[PDB]
Structure formats: C-alpha cells, structure tokens
Amino acid sequence: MSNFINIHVLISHSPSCLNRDDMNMQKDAIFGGKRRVRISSQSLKRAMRKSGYYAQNIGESSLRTIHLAQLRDVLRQKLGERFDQKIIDKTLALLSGKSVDEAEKISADAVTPWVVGEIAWFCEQVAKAEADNLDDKKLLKVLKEDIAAIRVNLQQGVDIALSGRMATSGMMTELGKVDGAMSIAHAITTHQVDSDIDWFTAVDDLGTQEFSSGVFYRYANINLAQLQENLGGASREQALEIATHVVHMLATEVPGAKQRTYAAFNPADMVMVNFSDMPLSMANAFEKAVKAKDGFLQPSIQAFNQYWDRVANGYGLNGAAAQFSLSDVDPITAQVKQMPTLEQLKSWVRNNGEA
Amino acid sequence: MSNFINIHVLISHSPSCLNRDDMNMQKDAIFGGKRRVRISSQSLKRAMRKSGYYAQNIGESSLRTIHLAQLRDVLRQKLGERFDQKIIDKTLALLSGKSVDEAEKISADAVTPWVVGEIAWFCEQVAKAEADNLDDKKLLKVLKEDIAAIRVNLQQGVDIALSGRMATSGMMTELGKVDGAMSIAHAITTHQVDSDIDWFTAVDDLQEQGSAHLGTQEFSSGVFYRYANINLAQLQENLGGASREQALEIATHVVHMLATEVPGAKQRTYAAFNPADMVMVNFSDMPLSMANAFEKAVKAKDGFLQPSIQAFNQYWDRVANGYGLNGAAAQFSLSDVDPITAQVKQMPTLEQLKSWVRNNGEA
Amino acid sequence: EIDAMALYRAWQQLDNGSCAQIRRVSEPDELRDIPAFYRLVQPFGWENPRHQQALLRMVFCLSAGKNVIRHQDKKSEQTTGISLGRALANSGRINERRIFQLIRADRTADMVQLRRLLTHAEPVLDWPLMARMLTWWGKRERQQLLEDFVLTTNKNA
Amino acid sequence: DEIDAMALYRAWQQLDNGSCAQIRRVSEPDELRDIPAFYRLVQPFGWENPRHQQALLRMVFCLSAGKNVIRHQDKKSEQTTGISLGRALANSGRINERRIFQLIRADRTADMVQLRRLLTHAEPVLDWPLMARMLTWWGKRERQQLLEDFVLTTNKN
Amino acid sequence: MRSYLILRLAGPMQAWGQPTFEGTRPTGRFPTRSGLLGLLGACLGIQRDDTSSLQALSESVQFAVRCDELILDDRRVSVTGLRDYHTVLGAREDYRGLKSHETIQTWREYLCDASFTVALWLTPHATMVISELEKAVLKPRYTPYLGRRSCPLTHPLFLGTCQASDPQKALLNYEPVGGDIYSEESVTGHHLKFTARDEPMITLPRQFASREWYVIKG
C-alpha cells in the first residue's frame, strides 16, 4: 500500500501549433542548456478535461467561469425543476459572496470551477435550513462540521478533485477549498528541437533527426490518499480507476486537432507507472539532451531506462513498477513487470500493481 | 573526533519555480557576477521540517505561531488529560509573558516556535511549584539552575535543536534561547540562469473567448548546490546532553532529507520532484562550503549536471590538498564520473552513505 | 501640454496585436523600435521633441496591460483625484520597501520597477494626474509618491 | 495654526529605535523626504499643510542628532523665555566661537548640517519650543541673534 | 496596547439630545457623551444626586462611536428621523405646589433605523476598572435605554472586549465595518473635528459644556 502513483510517459507527436504564447510562438523551456519545446501543464490538464475519453470514462467536467449572472441563468435552467428559483439564487449568493439579482452583469473575483451537482447539494442544505429556521451563520457552522459530505459531490467534478480549487469569497472560502491530488509537470522534449547544426562549417562538407515529430516527456503523479479524501472518502479502487484513466489520457492526448504521430499503428509510445512513498520525476534522464539515432524515440527510451536503473538502485526503490514499450531497447534491469499492450498496463494499475 | 559534519548536495531540477518573492518572481542571487536561481535556506528548512520523512524518522516538528489563544486551546485539548487547565494556562502565560484570559485573540509579539513536550515539562515544574507556594521569580531562579533538563525536551523538537530559537519575552527570554546546531545556506544554481516566462490564461467556459490579457510566471530549471553542516557538539548540548551516536543519527536524517526533499512551491503545476544526483558528506574540524567551485559559473556541455559535478570534484581536490584536510569523506553519485581524489570513499547507494555517517565515518 | 485622457482612450481602443506588441518591451526606449507606438502617440504631439520623454514614460506604464491602470474621475468635491501612491497603498499588494527602492532607483531603473508595481497592484487612479507626474518625474515627484504611499497606509490602518 | 513643538519633542523621545535609526541617517534635511518613518513621525503635526513643511524638516533634522541630544528644560516661572540656543551652546563649554561664525554665514542646507553637528557635540540644555520657533523662521535676524546670545553668554560665563 | 470594551446600541427608536430649554426636544445623529455616561450610569445603579460616583465615572471613561448603517435583504436603509407630537395634561405649572395646566405640548425627535457600535476605554487617572463596567453592562441595576425610557434595546448592550492601539483598530474587529467614527481620542491620519455640547457639568446639574469629537470618516 504505497500512497503515490507515478506516471512517466514518452509521447511522440508534432512539435508545432500545440501551445503558443502571446506572440504566435510555440512555448519552450531551457533544460540542461538546451531549448526544448514545451506544452504547459494548464494546457495538458484542460486538454484532458475536455477530451472525449474523459467525457466517456470520468464524467462531466467542471464549469469554470467568472460570470455569475450567466451561471445564474444556467443554474436556473438546469435546476429550476428541482428547487424554487429563489433557493437557487440564495445558494449561488451564499457560495459566491455576491448578490444575485436580475442584473445583466455580476462578476466573481476570479474564474472559479463550479460543479453543478455540488451546487444542487448546497441548494438542498439551504432549503432545508429555511424549513428549519436556521440563519446563514449556523448554516455555515454546521456545514463546516461534515465536509466529506460536500466532497462526495466532486465525483461529478473529478477534474477538481484532481487539480484543486481555491475560493476568495462566499461560503466556499471555508467549504470550497480543495487541495489537488494530481501533480503534473510541463511536457518537455527529451531532445533539442532546433536543428543541431552550424550552417557555416556545414556548407564545406556538402543518427538522423526528426522534424515533423518530437519526443516529449510527461510526468504526473497522483496522491491516492488525497484523491480518496477529495472524493468524499471513496475507496482505493475508485482512486485507482481514475488514476488509470489519467495514465491513459496522459499517454495519448495531444492538445488541438493533432494527435500522436503513430496514432493509427500503436496505442502509446512508451509508458511506465510506478508506485512509491515519495513522488519522484524522471526528467533528469534528459538533462543531457538526447541525440538522434533512428529518430529520437528509442534513444530516449534508452536514456529513461538507464536513469531508472541508476536512481532505483541508488535510492533503493522497491515499490511496484510496470512498463509498456514495444521498442527493443536494452531492457530495464530492475523488477519492472513488462506489459505486452497498453490495456494490460491499465489493468495493472487498476489492480494496485499485482495483476 | 571531528566536530563538524559537512553536507554537500548537487540536485538538478526540471522546469519549476521552487521559491519566489513578494512579486511572484524567482528568487535569485548574484554569484561570480552572474545570475543564479536561488532557493532560500528558510524554504529548505521548513520543507524538511514539515516533511513526511521527518515525521517518521525524527518526530514531531515544533509549532510556530503568534496566536496564543489558538495555541492555548490546542494545549488544552492535547494536555488536558495530564494537567488542570489553569496550570496549563499559567504555564503558557509565564513562558509567553502575556496574560492568558479566555479572550479568544491573544497575540505574542512575534511568531515563535512552541514545542509541546517542552511545555509539558514546564507544566510539571509549575504544578510542583504551586503545591509548594513557590514564587514565580523563585521558580525562574530554580529552573535557571538546570537548563540541561529543559533542553532534554528538545528531542521532541529536533528542528529547533538544529535551527535555534530566540524569544523576546516571558521566562523563555532566559530559558528558551537555543543556539542552532545546523547551519544551512541558500541553494544556488552552479550556472547562470536567464529565467523563462510562461504566458498563461484562464478560459471562461461561459463567454466567447475573444481577445484576452495573459498572465506571466517566471520559471526555470537548474542545477542547485545545497550546503549544510552540523555542529555535533552543539547538537548534543542542545539535546540535554545526548550522545554523539544520537547526533550522528539526526545528522544522518538531515543528509537524507537534504538529498531528497524539495520545496512544495508550484509543484502541483510544475512537478519537479527530482532526487539529488550527487551527495558528499565530509567530517571536519572547521566547517567549509564548496560553493566556490562554482564561482566561475559552470558552462554547459552535455548538460549542466556533469560539468557541475566535475567542478565540485576538482575544487575539492584543490582545497583538500591545499589546506591539508585529513577528515572522513564519502561521496554518492548517480553518474559514474571522473575520479575524485581517491581519499574519498565512494558509496554506490545513499543508505550505504548514511550508514557510513551513523558509524562516524569508519564503516 | 499633452492630452492625457485622449492617450488613455486611444490605448483602451488600440488593436490587441499592437497592444501585445507594445507590452513586450522591457525599457521605455525600446518603444522607439515599434511602429504601433508611433501611430499611437503621434496624435498627441510626439512630433514635438519637448513632449517625447514624457510620452515614452506614459505609454510604458500603460504597457503593463490594456486594463491594468483603471482610470477613475475625481469626485467634484475633491480638488484632485486619487494619486498613484494612494492607489498603490490602497491595493494592499505593495510593500513599502518596493516604493522606497523605487524612488531611489536611477533613471530608467525607475520606470521598469514602476511597471512591475503597476501590473502587480492593478491600481485605480486619476490617470491625468499620473500623467503629469510622469511628465515631470524629478526628485520631488518621486518623494511625493513615497509620501502619499506612507501617509495613506498610516491613515487607513 | 502654530506647530506643536513639545508634542513633536516627546514623540521623538518615545520613537522606536528602528525608526529613529532610519531617520538618523539623513545627511541633509530634504533627505527626510526619502524616509517613510519621517512622514509617519510628522503626520500628526501638520505635515500635510505645506505651510509647515520646511519648518518641520528643520526641527526633525536637528532632533535627528540623537534621541536625547537636545535636552529640553522648562523656563523658570519668573523669566519670560527659557534658555536660547546660542546660550546653551555657549554653556556647554564645547563649542568654539568660530563655529558659530561660520554657521551664520553658511548657505542654505549647509547651515542645518553644521548646526546638527554642533548639537551632537554640545548636547545643549535649552527651551526647545523656543528653538523650534527659531527654526521656524531662521533668517538673518535669527542667525544674528544666535551669535549675539553666544557672545554675551561666553562673555559673562 | 490598551484594552477596550465594546457595546452595541440598537433599537427601533433612539434619541440623543442637543441644547434646548424649550418644548421641542431635538436629536442629533449619534450618541452624545452625556448620554453614554448616562447609560453606563444606569447600569451602575447611580442615583442622580451621587455627584461623587458621577464624577468618578466621567473622569474614568472615554468613548468612540461608530455609526452603523442597516442592510436589509442586500439593500441599504438610511437612518431617518421622527417627530412626535407629545402632549402632557395635568402638567405642573410651577415647581412648588399643585396647580397644573390643562394641557401643554412638546415635540420630541427620534432616530429611526439607527444602530451604533461604541468603544470605551479607561483614562490614566481612572478610579475604575473595565471588569466592573463589563459586569455592569451584562447585569445592569437601573433600566437601560437608548436616550429616552420609551426606547428599548433590540440587542444586548455587551458586544465584546478586546485590545488595540487606536479606537479605530479596536472597532475594526466588529461588524459592520465601514461607518464613520467619532472619537474622544485622536487618530493619526485624521484631522477633522466635530463640535458638540455633550459634556455634563456634574457640579452644576443639567448643564452641559462644549467639547469636540475627532472624526474618522469611512
């Protein structure tokens, strides 16, 4: 029973039109002295969130906004048959800290994530309080007593239980603070994307590099205890189910229309999952930027494996570990159960690292 | 026997923002006329302090606060089974120098480290004192005679035995001054860093995106040099007179933490959970940092990490040979590197290094 | 003199491309390297060399963002509106030592630091007053900034 | 309407050591305007009224010689005023006449610097509100009266 | 730095007086010093002739008054006023004896929708201590009212007790924040004053002397 599960992913896809800044340029980042192409974790997260896989296997995603008026209209249309409009308005008002009239514009302090199931639950508590002659103050007081009952509703807002939420006003300041379970890094390429060439000297002499594809390292880990808590006390099984869908999405999703370069042929380029007591990232396997052989993918896997060996042996990691890669690279010595397909890896995660 | 344990660590981090200032900008520092990214000592100290490894292997961290009311209630709830409530309250008042009503906002003059075990022991002494109609000033006079029996309580407050404490009022003003045993430096990168900048937004799911204004968060990656040392004599003293064995124990736990613990800042979004790539521990008579190995900012070839480590090694040769350092030294490194001068015992794993420390550098 | 609210209104209605392109500078003089700047500030007398330095400063601050500096007209009662220092102090986001190190910061060091403060504090203020302050920007206008900051912080507590 | 001198005095006496320290570092009266602690000190005493600023700047500057360099003493019930600055300086036995000479002939700013040096050196005992009035006007007449009081005192005593 | 006692004066109607020797009995917009001294007096069952106790009280205590605006269902309700055509039949014609007027008439002004938060503290020459005042306000001896006896309190006189440097700072801990404050002690950033004739001349019954409030606007 280890508390952290670490997801290491090597993914091969285009290095362009993925994640741009304010000036039409693809994001990047310097690592080990070389410029890598970067996809930013906000982008990853939101790409996963709005993905179809998520919609079909996790649920509906949170409703993030700053427009309380329009949220008011939405909540009326979506809950209006179940509570009276006045109870809805009261509830949104108590949670946001703003007055809900029928004005045209009502802004919160910041863009906040909203779960409609959660809001509905609160509507229940508000209406019940109204029938029970409770003032807002002891309402807040009693709600503070059982929070897990509020977190149960995050099973309809899993993205929030995963990546967290802060509130600055309303009752949400004491009932709505959620500490995210999943930590996720920025995707960085394992290699330099600028062509490794001095064009001056080169013109005298008139591994092979890829250009329309690049190899990215994605790291994420999930704090199971934390996920269970944020979900209102759900079981380690439900945890592991969600963590599994995250291993999948992390291993497969590319922001925008684009997808993995070899999407139609294999299901994943390289994936390793590893249970542990303390999270640790493998990015340092690429501090020394990878140099091409037949492209960048298997020299990257080679690096990943060599480093995994040295770290595991050095720091004494005897937690469960599984890896999926259909490349024949020199094998990874430690007790790392190899997985023939992706799905088998996913089922190995679903089963707490034994299947 | 050598009094000082020197701990040097080289740790490389992926893109991250592990420590920032009042305006959300990475903490830096100028060294050798170049800009290094910096992680303050405080950030480290507290990261270690509140870490899980500390809770398992060392004990309970102190409780730092200024809100004496909240602290009062905490003390009541956690000690009520062993002492009567106004024994407790009077202890808190005597130690703090402030009146403990049941007003629910009572502030000390500054944030201060409170060790619950210490407080317990004081509770005993004062119960004893008022079974004896003994005066407060006289009790002060008594407790001042034997400070060691007060310091012995810091075994349930090692972080303070390591990092010292000063108060400005209450009996602590003469009973509570601890001179820290561990000295630790701000972590700095061994190379120049020009930080990168992430231009971000927040999508509003309810409005047509349109033109927006983008936020900016400074971030970078980098190879950091951590340094810390432990004054064994001082630590023994601060623990009521513990043995050198217990000190070498705590020292070991510090080595582990300093090699593995990373500040939590921005980690949910940059996740730079990196373990150290080199750890050297060196016993000595006079503490000495190796920061000067990177005074000439390390220039990168096949990364910053390899050149950093080689820099560290070469300087260590120079200084060792120069100042004539005959002290126990051991090194752990995830890379097989150019050989440091052979008088340093290589360790294939971190735990082997740690057992080498526990055993006073002879095993 | 230079029309302020005009320049403000022009900045509020500039096209987002030009806007983002301007924001990107890191020093007022770098604005001279940008076309959108010239088109922006030409209607307000950039062509007269007396007014140039001033404009460079004003725009630089505005370059913090299209809606970082929030103008608010002075109340008819009051003789002057909310000055910069009062605004910053009112933000609650600025530390006294930032202001102190601001007024002691050298030509040039000075504007960069101010812009950082502006983005951080997103102040509501009487803009033309700020504009005047930027027109002159000498020892006593700086010292006045520190005064307003310190005195407002003390008043409000 | 008129500036309270005694209030300011006592205020300076009870100031926290850090603030006093911060103020004690000016080397010139106008530098007081660079210092937060100063504005906090003189805010109650009408700093915000332009009429009293120069005056206040001098007062504080002289006080800024030390926390108890200027020992105030009340006048005797009989006589109409207390001890004048010149008289006290002369009474100290540490001040040489030529110092006063070069003082009353000094340019603006420089005179206050010199004066503060004389005050640190002498630790005079005097009627502070009197000195405060003197600093409030500080013109030819006052400089002259200073040297005269000095001379006649040194003559009899 | 200093310990404060915090009271709330709230009721449907209040009345805090201004100089009059006539049948119209005016009100101002917030508690008068005299009146607060009277409120405390009533709590500390002080009879009207007890000049010693009255003087002790007056020299011991000082006040700061905050004007709290009412909010109902997220709307502001301004303090308004009221004039009562107040009649008395069989009223004394003279101080001695029993002849009386058929009818006399008076006009008395009240404050509607008013509520105040008061902070009081002790003087350096205090004959009293705050524990006393707290005990009294919690268990008054004479009936406590808001100006006139026909004006009940709708909220306990005791609000709390705390410690600070300003009155302003003290009052910050207690909702609603944002109202104007009239204090007997100066607050550094603030320069405006407000003249009144609140101060009871205890040696001379039912006569008041001029004083000045310090104003801390919100």
mmCIF file of N, CA and C in Angstrom, chain C residues 96-97 100 103-104 139-140 143 146-147 150-151 154-155, chain D residues 22 30-31 33-37 39-40 43 47-48 53:
data_model
loop_
_atom_site.group_PDB
_atom_site.id
_atom_site.type_symbol
_atom_site.label_atom_id
_atom_site.label_comp_id
_atom_site.label_asym_id
_atom_site.label_seq_id
_atom_site.Cartn_x
_atom_site.Cartn_y
_atom_site.Cartn_z
ATOM 1 N N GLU C 96 6.164 48.480 1.326
ATOM 2 C CA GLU C 96 6.781 49.783 1.462
ATOM 3 C C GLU C 96 8.168 49.831 0.871
ATOM 4 N N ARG C 97 8.914 48.747 0.999
ATOM 5 C CA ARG C 97 10.292 48.776 0.562
ATOM 6 C C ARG C 97 10.391 48.749 -0.939
ATOM 7 N N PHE C 100 10.103 52.461 -1.588
ATOM 8 C CA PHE C 100 11.343 53.087 -1.165
ATOM 9 C C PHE C 100 12.424 52.821 -2.184
ATOM 10 N N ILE C 103 11.880 54.939 -5.450
ATOM 11 C CA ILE C 103 12.248 56.342 -5.579
ATOM 12 C C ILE C 103 13.754 56.559 -5.500
ATOM 13 N N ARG C 104 14.495 55.535 -5.104
ATOM 14 C CA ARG C 104 15.939 55.661 -5.001
ATOM 15 C C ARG C 104 16.653 54.973 -6.156
ATOM 16 N N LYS C 139 12.999 64.716 -8.471
ATOM 17 C CA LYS C 139 13.157 64.266 -7.097
ATOM 18 C C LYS C 139 11.894 64.464 -6.291
ATOM 19 N N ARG C 140 11.211 65.578 -6.494
ATOM 20 C CA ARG C 140 10.100 65.861 -5.609
ATOM 21 C C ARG C 140 8.836 65.132 -6.019
ATOM 22 N N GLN C 143 9.481 61.743 -4.391
ATOM 23 C CA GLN C 143 9.300 61.886 -2.960
ATOM 24 C C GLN C 143 7.842 62.052 -2.594
ATOM 25 N N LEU C 146 6.270 58.605 -2.551
ATOM 26 C CA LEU C 146 6.520 57.935 -1.272
ATOM 27 C C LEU C 146 5.655 58.513 -0.164
ATOM 28 N N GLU C 147 5.453 59.824 -0.201
ATOM 29 C CA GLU C 147 4.650 60.481 0.817
ATOM 30 C C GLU C 147 3.246 59.946 0.793
ATOM 31 N N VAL C 150 3.083 56.213 2.069
ATOM 32 C CA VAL C 150 3.245 56.072 3.506
ATOM 33 C C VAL C 150 2.089 56.660 4.298
ATOM 34 N N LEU C 151 1.663 57.845 3.905
ATOM 35 C CA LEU C 151 0.639 58.552 4.640
ATOM 36 C C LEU C 151 -0.716 57.898 4.491
ATOM 37 N N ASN C 154 -0.706 54.805 6.676
ATOM 38 C CA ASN C 154 -0.900 55.159 8.074
ATOM 39 C C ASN C 154 -2.319 55.597 8.374
ATOM 40 N N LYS C 155 -2.929 56.300 7.434
ATOM 41 C CA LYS C 155 -4.281 56.810 7.622
ATOM 42 C C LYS C 155 -5.250 55.655 7.769
ATOM 43 N N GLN D 22 16.395 55.014 11.374
ATOM 44 C CA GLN D 22 16.181 55.240 9.967
ATOM 45 C C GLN D 22 16.265 56.714 9.664
ATOM 46 N N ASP D 30 16.429 67.657 3.367
ATOM 47 C CA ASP D 30 15.448 67.256 2.378
ATOM 48 C C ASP D 30 15.438 65.755 2.196
ATOM 49 N N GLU D 31 16.513 65.090 2.606
ATOM 50 C CA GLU D 31 16.558 63.636 2.550
ATOM 51 C C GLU D 31 15.519 63.036 3.455
ATOM 52 N N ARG D 33 12.672 63.468 3.224
ATOM 53 C CA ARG D 33 11.528 63.185 2.385
ATOM 54 C C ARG D 33 11.658 61.853 1.686
ATOM 55 N N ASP D 34 12.786 61.195 1.884
ATOM 56 C CA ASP D 34 13.035 59.910 1.262
ATOM 57 C C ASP D 34 12.716 58.814 2.248
ATOM 58 N N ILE D 35 12.223 59.192 3.414
ATOM 59 C CA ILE D 35 12.172 58.264 4.524
ATOM 60 C C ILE D 35 10.792 58.113 5.133
ATOM 61 N N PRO D 36 10.216 56.910 5.036
ATOM 62 C CA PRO D 36 8.863 56.621 5.497
ATOM 63 C C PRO D 36 8.648 57.007 6.941
ATOM 64 N N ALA D 37 9.585 56.603 7.781
ATOM 65 C CA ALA D 37 9.490 56.839 9.213
ATOM 66 C C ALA D 37 9.297 58.306 9.557
ATOM 67 N N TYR D 39 7.729 60.704 7.620
ATOM 68 C CA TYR D 39 6.354 61.085 7.364
ATOM 69 C C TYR D 39 5.458 60.530 8.451
ATOM 70 N N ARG D 40 5.736 59.313 8.904
ATOM 71 C CA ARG D 40 4.940 58.770 9.994
ATOM 72 C C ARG D 40 5.124 59.589 11.257
ATOM 73 N N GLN D 43 3.370 63.297 10.610
ATOM 74 C CA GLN D 43 1.978 63.338 10.149
ATOM 75 C C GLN D 43 1.013 63.973 11.147
ATOM 76 N N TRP D 47 2.163 67.986 8.929
ATOM 77 C CA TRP D 47 2.993 67.870 7.746
ATOM 78 C C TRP D 47 2.201 68.123 6.490
ATOM 79 N N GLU D 48 0.923 67.798 6.534
ATOM 80 C CA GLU D 48 0.139 67.793 5.324
ATOM 81 C C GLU D 48 -0.195 69.204 4.919
ATOM 82 N N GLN D 53 5.965 72.613 6.323
ATOM 83 C CA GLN D 53 6.867 71.550 5.932
ATOM 84 C C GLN D 53 8.325 71.890 6.152
#
